[PDB]
Design a protein around this nucleic acid. Structure first.
Ligand SMILES: [Mg+2]
Ligand SMILES: [Mg+2]
Ligand SMILES: [Mg+2]
Ligand SMILES: [Mg+2]
Ligand SMILES: [Mg+2]
Ligand SMILES: [Mg+2]
Ligand SMILES: [Mg+2]
Ligand SMILES: [Mg+2]
Ligand SMILES: [Mg+2]
Ligand SMILES: [Mg+2]
Ligand SMILES: [Mg+2]
Ligand SMILES: [Mg+2]
Ligand SMILES: [Mg+2]
Ligand SMILES: [Mg+2]
Ligand SMILES: [Mg+2]
Ligand SMILES: [Mg+2]
Ligand SMILES: [Mg+2]
Ligand SMILES: [Mg+2]
Ligand SMILES: [Mg+2]
Ligand SMILES: [Mg+2]
Ligand SMILES: [Mg+2]
Ligand SMILES: [Mg+2]
Ligand SMILES: [Mg+2]
Ligand SMILES: [Mg+2]
Ligand SMILES: [Mg+2]
Ligand SMILES: [Mg+2]
Ligand SMILES: [Mg+2]
Lengths: 85, 120, 80, 64, 31, 19, 101
RNA sequence: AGAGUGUAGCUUAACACAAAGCACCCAACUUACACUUAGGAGAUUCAAUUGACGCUCUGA
RNA sequence: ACCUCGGAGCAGAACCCAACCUCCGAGCAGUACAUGCUAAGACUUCACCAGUCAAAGCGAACACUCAAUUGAUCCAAUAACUUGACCAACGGAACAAGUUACCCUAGGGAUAACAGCGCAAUCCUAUUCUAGAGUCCAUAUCAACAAUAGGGUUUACGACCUCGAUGUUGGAUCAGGACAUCCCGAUGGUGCAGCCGCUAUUAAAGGUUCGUUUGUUCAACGAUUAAAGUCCUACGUGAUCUGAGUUCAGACCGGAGUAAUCCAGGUCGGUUUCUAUCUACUUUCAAAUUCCUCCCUGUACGAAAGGACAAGAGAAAUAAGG
RNA sequence: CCGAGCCUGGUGAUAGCUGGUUGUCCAAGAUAGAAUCUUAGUUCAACUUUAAAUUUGCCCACAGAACCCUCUAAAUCCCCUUGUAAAUUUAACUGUUAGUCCAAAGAGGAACAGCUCUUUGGACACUAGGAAAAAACCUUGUAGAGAGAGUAAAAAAUUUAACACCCAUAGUAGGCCUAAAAGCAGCCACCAAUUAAGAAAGCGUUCAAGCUCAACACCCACUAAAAAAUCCCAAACAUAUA
RNA sequence: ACCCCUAUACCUUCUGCAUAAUGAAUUAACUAGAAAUAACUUUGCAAGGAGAGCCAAAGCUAAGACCCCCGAAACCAGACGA
């Protein structure tokens, strides 16, 4: 029932993102939390990498636009300055 | 002879009814693409295989983020039939340093800066 | 043997066609023009290649340790 | 695959069905003159130039 | 009798068939 | 070149009829 | 299978001597700083950048057949050919101090 | 009698240093023609933007 | 006939690339006599060998035209400078032909039922078309130019005469099957008075002869028959049998060749063995067809000549079972 | 066991031909050609492998790449940016190549199929799933264990021929050619009476005679094929919410 | 145990394909990659190296590390055979 899950904004595979996979499987009986699961560590790492990429690409494009705007302004300033004498 | 296909520009021109059908507007366009390969590069020309490799889409059903710029778009146009393109949506801000680790890309295409597994 | 097109096959085809039609739409609106795009990633692109060059140039035989050679004497380590 | 011209293509205006009726150059010099005229004129295609770039008075003089 | 088509080509032909418009009520049934 | 708009700029013997 | 054609496209750096194009017939005419060999091959006379342009064709008066063709043209007609140029990149030389006499 | 007007045949050539550039004709070569060479003739309709001398169409 | 070089069909547009084929051409010649010397940078027939262009400089003067127009090494001649192959099988052994059916060896291919499997050319069959034959009358019957459907055959270049193939094909034994029916059954039409016919529909239960070649390019002849069907089955079937051919070891004739020998020509003579391991099978059974004679009857029918059908009776032949 | 005996030696003759070539595990790894007494082979190149050095490689955007023949497309070359990480050079070797099928464009005397061949691309000689079994079609590739999950390609459709009822006088057998053509052997004109009929649209007579059709009333309805040889070949099913 | 479901023996050859063709009754034993120049790796010494000769414009010396098996019809020499 993947298509329905996508409509509800969940992953198509229940084994995807969500509390069923991402939460710890077990804990100590006394109440101490378990050491983190190896798969979950990997998932966290990949996600961090994706987020780092998102910010970097965003920054690059906005910086590119700013640089272009400055170039356009410089050209306009130059052309109006040359009107002297 | 089977050759590279050059695509007319007219197909990459969005009609008003297209703007109704898909939630986007020509003013304030989306900054980033989410691209997933949904179709194999087997039984497909070498140039398409190479462009898939460049975009980092070797593995199927994995989302990759790309700049929505003409040069990247040019590469996506060649392999458009192998891929699914959705705009990256940011309901909150783009992630800060404190919330960099705690992120999740949802199937809707929105990246959430807070992802604690508690229900609402 | 003649092959025929089923309803399922037609449905599968239209499903893919629907996806690619949406693909067209999202490629329709670029954020930057070609002129604005020029040289924005140049610095990063350069540095990335210097990283590749550094890796290539750094190729050299590994260090050889006296400890490694002497440790082979332990093959005849015995109790008294 | 063809692209239409970006301006008036040369020799287009003079192109008529009847060619025998049209007057022609009979001399090298006439064509030459017209050629320099064309060369000096600006063009939409790439060119070499782009890369390598008183009444009383009259009466008195007439009398003289 | 026609030349045998590639299956992908035949599928494309099948998908791209003229569909006539169907009114909600048949015109004959209407006064 | 054929694809370019400057195609057939050097066409000459449509202007003459050597018959 | 004579392997004749353009060897250097537009915007390519050439050195003096470099063969721009081999042709058999005059498809591309020599322009600025471009020599023509016996075999009709075009070669760079200077170090620079290769450009292709469309220029008005005026043949040498001694060239009988070309002059004949010219004299058969209508009054408004001008002939155009493709021309290969080399735009020189470096100055001929520089003046530098050798002796503070 | 009214209207339209206006440089040698042509040119929305003429800011000026200027009335210019193609047309045209004679002579030589050519059976001729053409090319070339060697020569010749040429004009702002008149008076202060305006008025009247020439031209074309409309009245008898 | 061809083998090397150049051009076109020929990659529609950088280069390269269309084998085989269809066409063309080349194996020079003319003018110089600085057609001297030297030297950056390049191109390149997809390698190499070869081949191509050329700035500047020295010395002169005021690096020719042509699409190809050609040949390595060795060696020989020569004081040197140079020169030497129709080495054309054109990357070229310094110089060597036929024939083998007396043949041999190492292999490959058929082997043997494919090697060419989704339709161009041609043939046959059926349908469509409705010109035309049929006294008039398309459709009793036949059918031109064509079209459609199914089944065969052939096809990439000497727009040369061939003759091919060859577990190729006869016969025996036993047959299995198809129907597109030769006979026997039942129908519709007729240019069906009746007997014979012509044509189509339906029918594969049963049956479908014995002999002989003077001439005949897949042919006859004699006598019969109810009829002497057309095909598929790896010639159906050679571990059941047997002619001929491929097809030869010997020999002769005609022709070819100096000969040895050959024939895509003719004629005579001429060796393939098998003890069945496996699969399959080894009294399905209990149902028969046909011809002729007689009756009807010499009837109906028909002007006569001639001459039925049903129903019945008798005799046979074959087949199956005793 | 004689188209040239046998034995021994030379002799481990030679064989570009046939056959064979022995532990374990991992990795990279496939189809431009040229010359050749050469196409059953070899040498060079191309591709492949390793190690080393160094900087660009690939993807590419404007600009740029012919006239002639009277036409000609998909495309190609070149190429900053960009997305990427590879490329070139150096040293050292071997091995592979008439590849097959599919899609597309073509070539072989102006042969739409077939055969042979060239080019572009894909797959195959590497995994699995699907199409009935299935090298080459579709889906899919990087490796293990699991008695978890989401998916990809993925099930052929179709059933077909009715048709009008009623009624018809007459200028004249309309003139010419014809034994005669008289509505229908042929040519010219094509009027005209009733209320309404064509100097007659199709049959039929040697020619006539006749049966329709159009005409007036009456008001009715009128809407395209099949066959073969051992024995047909999944079973089946129109009706519970993609 | 079988019944159920899944599964087209191995080797070798042909431009490519196996399911075609080749080889194998089975067991035991026997039965098939030999070396150089040049490079690479690791030492020694170093404008020199080497236990005469030889090499050397960082080389020289030493070591390690690459090149199969079976099969013709034949040819010749000397014997042996009516
Ligand atoms: Mg080369
Ligand atoms: Mg070649
Ligand atoms: Mg010079
Ligand atoms: Mg030869
Ligand atoms: Mg040769
Ligand atoms: Mg050659
Ligand atoms: Mg004999
Ligand atoms: Mg075989
Ligand atoms: Mg064989
Ligand atoms: Mg008739
Ligand atoms: Mg055959
Ligand atoms: Mg039988
Ligand atoms: Mg029948
Ligand atoms: Mg037979
Ligand atoms: Mg047998
Ligand atoms: Mg005898
Ligand atoms: Mg041997
Ligand atoms: Mg591997
Ligand atoms: Mg030779
Ligand atoms: Mg040979
Ligand atoms: Mg060989
Ligand atoms: Mg580039
Ligand atoms: Mg082939
Ligand atoms: Mg009527
Ligand atoms: Mg055996
Ligand atoms: Mg004796
Ligand atoms: Mg004796």
């Amino acid at each position: 029932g993947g298509q329905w899950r996508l409509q509800q904004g969940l992953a198509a595979n229940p084994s995807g993102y969500g509390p069923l996979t991402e939460l710890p499987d077990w804990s100590y009986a006394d109440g101490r939390p378990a050491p983190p699961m190896k798969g979950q560590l990997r998932r966290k790492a990949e996600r961090e990498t994706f987020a780092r990429r998102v910010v970097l690409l965003s920054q690059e494009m906005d910086a590119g636009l700013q640089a272009w705007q400055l170039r356009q302004q410089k050209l306009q300033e130059e052309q109006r300055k040359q009107e002297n004498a | 002879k089977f050759t590279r296909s050059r695509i007319p520009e007219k197909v990459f021109q969005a009609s008003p009814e297209d703007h109704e059908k898909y939630g986007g507007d020509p003013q304030n366009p989306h900054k980033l693409h989410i691209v997933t390969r949904i179709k194999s590069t087997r039984r497909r020309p070498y140039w398409e295989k190479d462009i898939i490799k460049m975009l980092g889409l070797e593995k199927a059903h994995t989302p990759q983020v790309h700049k929505n710029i003409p040069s990247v778009n040019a590469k996506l146009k060649v392999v458009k039939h192998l891929i699914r393109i959705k705009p990256l949506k940011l309901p909150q801000g783009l992630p800060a340093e404190e919330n960099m680790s705690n992120t999740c890309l949802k199937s809707t295409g929105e990246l959430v800066v807070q992802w604690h597994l508690k229900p609402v | 043997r003649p092959r025929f097109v089923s309803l399922r096959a037609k449905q599968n085809m239209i499903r893919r066609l629907e996806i690619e039609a949406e693909n067209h739409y999202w490629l329709s609106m670029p954020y930057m023009t070609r002129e604005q795009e020029r040289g924005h990633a140049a610095v990063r692109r350069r540095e990335a290649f210097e990283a590749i060059k550094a890796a290539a140039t750094s190729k050299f035989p590994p260090h050889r340790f006296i400890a490694d050679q002497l440790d082979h004497l332990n093959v005849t380590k015995k109790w008294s | 695959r063809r692209t239409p011209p970006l301006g008036p293509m040369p020799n287009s205006d003079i192109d008529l069905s009847n060619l025998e009726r049209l007057e022609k150059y009979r001399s090298f010099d006439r064509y030459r003159r017209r050629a320099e005229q064309e060369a000096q004129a600006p063009h939409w295609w790439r060119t070499y130039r782009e890369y390598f770039g008183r009444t009383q008075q009259l009466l008195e003089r007439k009398q003289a | 009798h026609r030349r045998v088509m590639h299956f992908q080509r035949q599928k494309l032909m099948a998908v791209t068939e003229y569909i006539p418009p169907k009114p909600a009520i048949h015109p004959s049934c209407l006064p | 070149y054929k694809t370019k708009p400057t195609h057939g700029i050097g066409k000459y013997k449509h202007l003459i009829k050597a018959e | 299978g004579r392997r004749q054609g353009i060897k250097k496209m537009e915007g390519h750096y050439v050195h003096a001597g470099n063969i721009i194009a081999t042709q058999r017939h005059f498809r591309w005419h020599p322009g600025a700083h471009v020599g023509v060999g016996k075999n009709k091959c075009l070669y760079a006379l200077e170090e620079g950048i290769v450009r292709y342009t469309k220029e008005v064709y005026v043949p040498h008066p001694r060239n009988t057949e070309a002059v004949d063709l010219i004299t058969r043209l209508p009054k408004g007609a001008v002939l155009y050919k493709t021309f290969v140029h080399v735009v020189p990149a470096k100055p001929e030389g520089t003046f530098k101090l050798v002796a503070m006499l």
